[PDB]
């Protein structure tokens, strides 16, 4: 209920559509003043060290320099 029309939408069907068995989290901080993250729980990305999801953070958003903590991935 409530938001029937979802914001950050096109974040959370690219990366439903990219991997299906992806599950996207949006990271909300509790105040509106900070950005906010996607977090990305996906098999695809377990097993995978920070290493490895760091570069393939780079794969996938390869389109700017990843710097800074804007996409989550499930770390384990």
Same mark, same amino acid.
């Given at each position: 209920?409530? @938001?029937?029309? =979802?914001?950050? #939408? /096109?974040?959370?069907?690219?990366?439903?559509?990219?991997?299906?068995?992806?599950?996207?989290? *949006?990271?909300?901080?509790?105040?509106?003043?900070?950005?906010? @993250?996607?977090? =990305?729980?996906? #098999? /695809?990305?377990?097993?995978?060290?920070?290493?490895?999801?760091?570069?393939?953070?780079?794969? *996938?958003?390869?389109?700017?320099?990843?710097?800074?903590?804007?996409?989550?991935?499930?770390?384990?």
């Amino acid at each position: 209920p409530g @938001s029937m029309t =979802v914001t950050q #939408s /096109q974040l959370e069907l690219l990366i439903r559509n990219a991997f299906p068995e992806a599950e996207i989290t *949006v990271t909300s901080l509790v105040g509106d003043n900070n950005h906010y @993250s996607i977090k =990305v729980i996906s #098999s /695809q990305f377990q097993g995978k060290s920070k290493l490895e999801q760091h570069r393939m953070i780079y794969k *996938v958003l390869d389109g700017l320099n990843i710097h800074a903590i804007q996409i989550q991935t499930g770390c384990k």
